[PDB]
Ligand binder design. Structure first.
Ligand SMILES: CCCCCCCC(=O)OC[C@H](COP(=O)(O)O[C@@H]1[C@H](O)[C@H](O)[C@@H](OP(=O)(O)O)[C@H](OP(=O)(O)O)[C@H]1O)OC(=O)CCCCCCC
Ligand SMILES: *[C@@H]1O[C@H](CO)[C@@H](O[C@@H]2O[C@H](CO)[C@@H](O[C@@H]3O[C@H](CO)[C@@H](O)[C@H](O)[C@@H]3O)[C@H](O)[C@H]2NC(C)=O)[C@H](O)[C@H]1NC(C)=O
Ligand SMILES: *[C@@H]1O[C@H](CO)[C@@H](O[C@@H]2O[C@H](CO)[C@@H](O)[C@H](O)[C@H]2NC(C)=O)[C@H](O)[C@H]1NC(C)=O
Ligand SMILES: *[C@@H]1O[C@H](CO)[C@@H](O)[C@H](O)[C@H]1NC(C)=O
Ligand SMILES: *[C@@H]1O[C@H](CO)[C@@H](O)[C@H](O)[C@H]1NC(C)=O
Ligand SMILES: *[C@@H]1O[C@H](CO)[C@@H](O)[C@H](O)[C@H]1NC(C)=O
Ligand SMILES: *[C@@H]1O[C@H](CO)[C@@H](O)[C@H](O)[C@H]1NC(C)=O
Lengths: 343, 116, 105, 325, 325, 330, 330
């Protein structure tokens, strides 16, 4: 009676239990109550269009074949009782590769109350698809979804609901946010009905709204482009005669523009359209190429081969370009930074 | 699936009244229970929520202190208490059951409270 | 909290034509909006749940239509027993309701 | 049928949870190892790869039988039914047996109870590399294995006279290193769970400096020779000599970055760091000599033609002999 | 009513020989099958594979799973499949595939009251595709997926698509980062392998590569660096260092772009269409550099003869390249 | 003999054992003591924000059902009896991948005691996540943790404690990271509260400081070098335009090149680092060096006195900037 | 119906069957005939010295205990009966990591013949290691081997043999190789003698010939064209100093770049390959081409030495190309 009291109870519940059958098969849906405690929103891979999430996926349903009367109201059992009873086969619709953690013992728990209410919490690391639209890259915001539902049981057999209020059913941990470049604004849940070839299922949708931070692309791509187009714009301030001094201002700036375009394109998946960074790079490339062809136009108009401390003179094209180029680039910068920063 | 309550009550202002909501055909502890207030010729407003399995209750931010909700599984009846009753507190009080997709499927017959 | 604006307030038709009742919210309450009717001296009865999911015992004329914020109940070919006070309420958070719409002849 | 009832008589009351003679004497284990290959010594991760035929022999009095056949050549199925030692490699980062097409184990039971059990393994063991003299570095990569649960008073490991035999001497994936010698020691270490008998195999390897001479050392010398070429150009050609300065500086910075990519994540100066640092200072002494020559503007240009090659010819003839012997 | 169900499941799975197919001695079993494509993942060409996930469902007509009790479908759990006959359908061009086990193993089985089973998985396959890179990047691939029994021949099994053309769905709501799928086809076969005749169903996908990534990363940098080399003609002849630095740095980066193109490309032996176009403008810079060597040898009608020849040559080269592809 | 007195005793211990029930299930919580012997800390990867740790994870509790009297020795059974005994459900919360080594068998150990104490050891290689504040990189000071916690047992079922206090965790004095260095390690015993109850938690946490010499050599020294090389153009006269302009261009482009090259070894972090601030300051210095010659060529040839003031200006202010940077961040 | 007969015959075979013993244990050794249907010789990685190979590995042997006389067909059972029958311990010696596919069901095939001939056949992907003596790179010719032997049984207990002499290996002809062009495959039987006994080994060798094309477009033609680009420096007039010295130093720096940016397509091999001999044979020409201008600038025998260099260098480079290409191309 010291230990066999609970043993006899656990033998009484598991006797006559067909684990292949859902509770209330030909009588009622098996109401399943679900909530997610997100411990750590992991890193988001832009290249693979996927994100990683670490959860404490909780489920709760009502099996009346597990009722008991005894000295303890709630039986907290280990993982071995979970394999010997019915469990819902919930799978993630947009999941790519999710690993249930087994160190040191399968991260599961099972709590059976005396009225038949169960609670089956699993710890999962889910890699899910996040379809991205990188048209306003990098000043873009995504809504990464997480769709889960039953695989074998239709709408008439198993339905899903949130065990708390839907605003407070997906809880994100405070210190746990492994996001590097994005920023988690907030969660958003949804419950719909999907229709497939095998039948009609119940799907639960959770959207995570992410906003990309701008500091890395400003400090790595935008500001080097601004500095090199400023560097190509000081070409007009030198002497008209110094052709070998001013040809490197064309050549090296064009080479840095091309390799900056390559380095900026090599940090994002190979999409078929052009981002806002591509438009900024193209306009800056047009400016540095315009500087080079203006110098070529000056060199065509440059007579003689000496310098006056003698009528080589400063070019009027040069004098107009010194005012025309940085003002036009500032106008483009104002238009570009006012168009995309308020969307 | 049948919800029953008390009758109509009239009290002086500043008094206290306890009203009840009993149920049949189901156990209360599986689902939530909702209390709402229906003012005459007006809209509906939600008073509070009670979870009978956990004993967890919470209320509208306009209705703390003067409205508390208690549950009793053994009598199969959910209780609501009103304190510091005012002249504007006259309404009809409905008792609601949480149902499918949070819809308030079954509603009580309503108890009309009045002042004098 | 979450406010539920119900429009229009009071308008009356004849018998046998379509009508639409609009419901709006301050933030996202997506497919968690319940519609009820209020006969005089009667308890409220659930018409549709979710966004567009017909309850048992509800005729085919009542049809909802849902979105993130905007919701619409459509009653096509109304009758003389369909007059009530129609209430729109959300349940994405702690629940709220609207003012109610009146149907007369 | 006769062999079947002999094998059935062995597993009648046999308890695989208990080592043989649990309360009588230590279970003496004779160990042997045949090395197929030593894999590529990963310098960056401080680790190496081996592929062995780990052999264990011990005694079990419960497996004593009497038959017409002497040995019982069996398969990997009866491996999981008898007592097996729990030997693990103490400096292994990640090891795995081979399972295609069958678990690569065997089991032979002699008449006296002598059990031989070998298995083919691949161990990505950890070798501690101190790169204070890279690339002229000699290393002693270890391989330590012991029991995990049984202390020195329960099982005792022992070499079986023979030792690590390397195979046909040509089946190595060692690219740079050459197998110099193999050493075998036994040891007793004390941990928190008791004292265990640890058997260590030391492999001695020496790095050949071919790739670091072709890729790094020869261009680093020849760019310095190219910098020495810049003195013969007359001083009136200012952009000619400034280009010879700046391009040498940029390519030496690029080679210093590439070589630092080829260092195995060190935190201290190495010999290759001093090789690149001497040439680093050499290619800037010439450029600041040209800078002060242009500030003065021909005698110091002729003076600089004899300083740098003599300094380099004393420097390498000191340094290579000092740091190869 | 619960005991009515469990007396049926414990009767169907009692006396059922899992090792024997339906009608092993009689006529061959026909396995109808549908595919619901969920999401075509990345199409890598350095490894020559496309990653595909799908809802692979099968449907045969087993006879021992017949009951006259429950009038419903009896949709059971995923743990029943293990205790029932399953066809050995594999993927020929598979490299590494797996079926998800989160949270429970993703399987579904419905034992319809006459004999019908509707077994279905959720498989993610990394299928190898025969890619033809003669016209890269303006090319067009036909990637195939081939399914087949592994042990059962045409005398024992036959595969058919369940719905005629309506057995493969979900291809319209698909995502591709680079390609654009335009066509798909069902076709049945009868392969002849050593063991004997096996039925093969081949599912083929047509992928058309988009140009817009390469049109601004490679093609416009290659075109605009040719115009960069064309500024060299407008420079005056007496400026010696001004024109060769504008000449040779346009071909060093063209060599750099040529080297920084094939590391994102596989280890291809032959010439792609991008490499024809890259080498087409690569000799044009040599024609500019030979023009500078010719005009420096003379010293000048050569200077403006090129501007009457070079815009004609490159534009005609651009016409015959883009129209051919 | 003494082989059926160790066989029948183990069979009596394993007869009627319920693995589904913890020891003292309907009563007081069971105490679990933990010792960790770190074998190595392999890769502190800043890109993947994690570190790989190999340890000898040992647990010790007391089960009264596993009590024997007749044999006077500490029983050490095979590693396969652990699937027939109760073990705690200890999980690391911040791990990403873990595996018990399985060569030649599964690296685990069950040792019983005559008083009922069970010692359960594991050789675990885990990759625990560790968020890093890279603002002061490469002079940073990271605090990586490893949170040991029970999963399905509330604090009235299992109590965790470090066995033998500060000597519970060993092997920290060794452990030589290629670029880091262990400064201090701490052991924290607390309780966390989730939505299903309160759970015990042990925390092993190291303070890693970064060795600075390698990052000084491979990053910092070329920056001052390119700054001095840009200052070299001040000594050249005004008329040699091509040489000074080419020198300024090569300095600013290779500063930009090494700036872009140093980013790809690091994640896409959205703030300026100390190394990025230093490279920005040197970039402004070598940019003003070229703009000085642009001003000289604009005043004289367009329309020495500017030049020798710039000879004074640029070494001095850079030394003032080098003093400010190396004293604020150290 | 046939169902009762086939379920009572396959249970007579598996009643009293001893899986731990090979067939005919007390007498002559069992002979195992094998065939390999190569599906796809995948990527031959040469920086890791291994070739990935997938195939249909079939084995065949006679077991006298599986004799039945009721069903005159090929009894093709499920693949889960293989865990209940005897399987030879056939393993690959040069394996690094191999796996059998388990999608959707484990890719195994069994067939019980009425005499007893089992036709156990797997679908295995092997990453077998290959011996590469790459000294004539890239114009080399490798011999990648595959050694297929038993583990637990000697020559006294098992005998491996090929089912058909040069009719066993099939599918090697049409194949997917990214670089190499396979020309020859050879099958050799052997008897290796280890310490534990003598084991039978079946050796399968493949001959791969590298394709020159990628290297002749990516390395050899850029090297020749940069030699010509450095040879443009001869036809410049001597007065242009910065022009000619930039024309020399950019060519030698890009030759150094090509020398460095080719070693990532090779291992860390210590000796010198043919491609490195050809690449160092072009570095010396650019270096002597620039030393020629060093001598010219020292002299200024100005135009005459330049004309002698112009008429001397192409004959020497043509002779170098003749003695290089004839020595390796056969
Ligand atoms: C994109 C560039 C487009 C350039 C289009 C260029 C279109 C075009 O053909 O312009 C001609 C002229 C050239 O000006 P620039 O000063 O460069 O040329 C001078 C001009 O030709 C004088 O007439 C010459 O004196 P002279 O009496 O002959 O002795 C003088 O000779 P010298 O003093 O050297 O001895 C030349 O240098 O420019 C404009 O009028 C303003 C253009 C502003 C263009 C602003 C564009 C933003
Ligand atoms: C690394 O980070 C961890 C996590 O913050 C640090 O652990 C913290 O350690 C301090 C003591 O060293 C704990 O403070 C204690 O708080 C209790 C609260 O009642 C107080 O009573 C004690 O007297 C003590 O002050 C603190 O709670 C703890 N933080 C957490 C979250 O557990 C750790 O110190 C850091 N450094 C190292 C080297 O590990
Ligand atoms: C089993 O091992 C324990 C150690 O874990 C032994 O306990 C030691 O006993 C000696 C006296 O015999 C004491 O001096 C030590 O301090 C003890 N160590 C600890 C840590 O308590 C124990 O005696 C051994 N034998 C058995 C069968 O219990
Ligand atoms: C957890 O999963 C791993 C991976 O398959 C497996 O090796 C391990 O045995 C599992 N844990 C348990 C307790 O079965
Ligand atoms: C180590 O190996 C050598 C060579 O096999 C052998 O002579 C020596 O005895 C071994 N050492 C032992 C067994 O302690
Ligand atoms: C693809 O290839 C297969 C096999 O060669 C062929 O049958 C099919 O028609 C091709 N095209 C399409 C549209 O898949
Ligand atoms: C490859 O090498 C083995 C080893 O001796 C040899 O037997 C075989 O014939 C070789 N293959 C050839 C020459 O094709």
């Amino acid at each position: 009676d010291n230990t066999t009291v609970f043993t006899r109870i656990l033998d009484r519940l598991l006797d006559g239990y067909d684990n292949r059958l859902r509770p209330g098969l030909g009588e009622r849906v098996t109401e399943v109550k679900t909530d997610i405690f997100v411990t750590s929103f992991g890193p988001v891979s832009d290249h693979d269009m996927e994100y990683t999430i670490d959860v404490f996926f909780r489920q709760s349903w009502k099996d009346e074949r597990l009722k008991f009367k005894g000295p303890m109201t709630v039986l907290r059992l280990n993982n071995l009782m979970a394999s010997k009873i019915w469990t819902p086969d919930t799978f993630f619709h947009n999941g790519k590769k999710s690993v249930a953690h087994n160190m040191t013992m399968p991260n599961k728990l099972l709590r059976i109350t005396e009225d038949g209410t169960l609670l089956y919490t699993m710890r999962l690391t889910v890699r899910a698809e996040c379809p991205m639209h990188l048209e306003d890259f990098p000043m873009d915001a995504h809504a990464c979804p997480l769709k889960f539902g039953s695989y074998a049981y239709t709408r008439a057999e198993v339905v899903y609901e949130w065990t708390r209020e839907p605003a407070r059913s997906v809880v994100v941990a405070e210190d746990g946010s492994r996001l590097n470049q994005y920023d988690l604004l907030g969660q958003t849940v949804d419950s719909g009905i999907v229709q497939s070839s095998t039948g009609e299922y119940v799907v639960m949708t959770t959207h995570f709204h992410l906003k990309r931070k701008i500091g890395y692309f400003v400090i790595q791509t935008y500001l080097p482009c601004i500095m090199t187009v400023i560097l190509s714009q000081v070409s007009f301030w030198l002497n008209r005669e110094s052709v070998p001094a001013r040809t490197v201002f064309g050549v090296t700036t064009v080479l840095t523009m091309t390799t900056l375009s390559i380095s900026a394109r090599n940090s994002l998946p190979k999409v078929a359209y052009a981002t806002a960074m591509d438009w900024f790079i193209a306009v800056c490339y047009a400016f540095v190429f315009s500087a080079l062809i203006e110098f070529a136009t000056v060199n065509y108009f440059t007579k003689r081969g000496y310098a006056w401390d003698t009528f080589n003179s400063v070019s009027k094209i040069d004098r107009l370009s010194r005012i025309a180029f940085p003002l036009l680039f500032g106008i483009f910068n104002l238009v570009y930074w006012a168009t995309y920063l308020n969307r | 699936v049948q919800l029953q309550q008390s009758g109509a009550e009239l009290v002086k202002p500043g008094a206290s009244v306890k009203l009840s909501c009993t149920a049949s055909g189901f156990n209360i502890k599986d689902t939530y229970m909702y209390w709402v207030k229906q003012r005459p010729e007006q809209g509906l407003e939600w008073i509070g929520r009670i979870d009978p399995a956990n004993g967890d209750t919470k209320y509208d931010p306009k209705f703390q202190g003067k409205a508390t909700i208690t549950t009793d599984t053994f009598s199969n009846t959910a209780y609501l208490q009103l304190s510091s009753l005012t002249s504007e507190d006259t309404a009809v009080y409905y008792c609601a059951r949480k149902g499918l997709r949070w819809a308030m499927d079954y509603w009580g017959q309503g108890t009309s409270v009045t002042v004098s | 909290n979450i406010v539920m604006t119900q429009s229009p307030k009071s308008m009356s038709m004849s018998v046998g034509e379509r009508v639409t009742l609009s419901c709006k919210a301050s933030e996202y309450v997506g497919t968690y909006v319940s519609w009820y009717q209020q006969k005089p001296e009667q308890s409220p009865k659930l018409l549709i749940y979710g966004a567009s999911n017909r309850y048992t015992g509800v005729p085919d004329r009542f049809t909802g239509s849902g979105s993130a914020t905007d919701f619409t109940l459509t009653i096509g070919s109304v009758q003389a027993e369909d007059l009530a006070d129609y209430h729109c309420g959300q349940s994405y958070s702690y629940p709220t309701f609207g003012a109610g719409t009146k149907l007369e002849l | 049928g006769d062999v079947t009832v002999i094998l059935n008589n062995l597993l009648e009351g046999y308890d695989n949870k208990l080592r043989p003679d649990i309360g009588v004497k230590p279970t003496l284990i004779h160990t042997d190892m045949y090395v197929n290959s030593i894999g590529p010594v990963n310098a960056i991760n401080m680790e190496y790869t081996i592929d062995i035929f780990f052999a264990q022999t011990w005694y079990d009095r419960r497996l004593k039988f009497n038959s017409t056949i002497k040995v019982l050549r069996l398969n990997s199925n009866m491996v999981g039914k008898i007592w097996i030692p729990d030997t693990f490699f103490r400096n292994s980062k990640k090891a795995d047996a081979h399972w295609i097409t069958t678990p690569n184990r065997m089991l032979r039971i002699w008449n006296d109870g002598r059990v031989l059990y070998t298995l083919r393994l691949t161990i990505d063991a950890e070798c501690q590399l101190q790169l204070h003299n890279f690339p002229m570095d000699e290393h002693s990569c270890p391989l330590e294995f012991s029991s995990y649960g049984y202390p020195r008073e329960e099982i005792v490991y022992q070499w079986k006279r023979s030792s690590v035999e390397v195979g046909d001497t040509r089946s190595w994936r060692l690219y740079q290193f050459s197998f110099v010698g193999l050493r075998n020691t036994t040891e007793v270490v004390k941990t928190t769970s008791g004292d265990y008998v640890v058997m260590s195999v030391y492999f001695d390897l020496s790095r050949r400096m071919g790739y670091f001479t072709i890729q790094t050392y020869i261009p680093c010398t020849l760019i310095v020779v190219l910098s020495w070429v810049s003195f013969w150009i007359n001083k009136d050609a200012v952009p000619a000599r400034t280009s010879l300065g700046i391009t040498t500086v940029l390519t030496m910075t690029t080679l210093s970055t590439i070589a630092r990519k080829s260092l195995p994540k060190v935190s201290y100066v190495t010999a290759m760091d001093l090789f690149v640092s001497v040439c680093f200072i050499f290619v800037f002494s010439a450029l600041v000599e040209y800078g002060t020559l242009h500030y003065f503007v021909a005698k110091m240009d002729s003076y600089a033609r004899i300083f740098f090659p003599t300094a380099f010819c004393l420097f390498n003839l000191v340094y290579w002999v000092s740091y190869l012997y | 009513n619960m005991s009515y169900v469990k007396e049926t499941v414990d009767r169907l799975l009692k006396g059922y020989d899992i090792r024997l197919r339906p009608d092993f001695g009689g006529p061959p079993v026909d396995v109808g099958m549908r595919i619901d494509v969920a999401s075509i993942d990345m199409v890598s060409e350095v490894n020559m594979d496309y990653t595909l996930t799908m809802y692979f469902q099968q449907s045969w007509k087993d006879k021992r799973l017949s009951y006259s009790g429950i009038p419903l479908n009896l949709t059971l759990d995923n743990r029943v499949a293990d205790q029932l006959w399953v066809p050995d359908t594999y993927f020929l061009n598979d490299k590494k595939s797996f079926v998800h086990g989160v949270t429970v193993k993703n399987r579904m089985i419905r034992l319809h009251p006459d004999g019908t089973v509707l077994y279905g998985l959720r498989i993610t396959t990394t299928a190898a595709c025969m890619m033809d890179l003669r016209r890269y990047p303006l090319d067009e691939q036909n990637c195939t997926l081939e399914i087949e029994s592994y042990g059962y021949t045409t005398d024992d099994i036959e595969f058919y698509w369940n719905g005629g053309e309506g057995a493969v769905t979900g291809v319209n709501k698909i995502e591709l980062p680079q390609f654009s799928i335009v066509d798909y086809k069902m076709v049945s076969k009868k392969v002849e392998f050593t063991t004997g005749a096996y039925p093969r169903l081949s599912l083929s996908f047509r992928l058309k590569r988009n140009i817009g990534y390469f049109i601004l990363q490679t093609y416009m940098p290659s075109t605009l660096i040719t115009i960069l080399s064309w500024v060299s003609f407008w420079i005056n002849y007496d400026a010696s260092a001004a024109r060769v630095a504008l000449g040779i740095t346009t071909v060093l980066t063209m060599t750099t772009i040529s080297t920084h193109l094939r590391e994102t490309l596989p280890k291809i032996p032959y010439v792609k269409a991008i490499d024809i176009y890259l080498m087409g403008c690569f000799v044009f810079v040599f024609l500019a550099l030979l023009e500078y060597a010719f005009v420096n040898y003379i010293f000048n009608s050569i200077d403006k003869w090129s501007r009457m020849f070079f815009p004609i040559t490159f534009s005609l080269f651009n016409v015959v390249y883009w129209l051919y592809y």
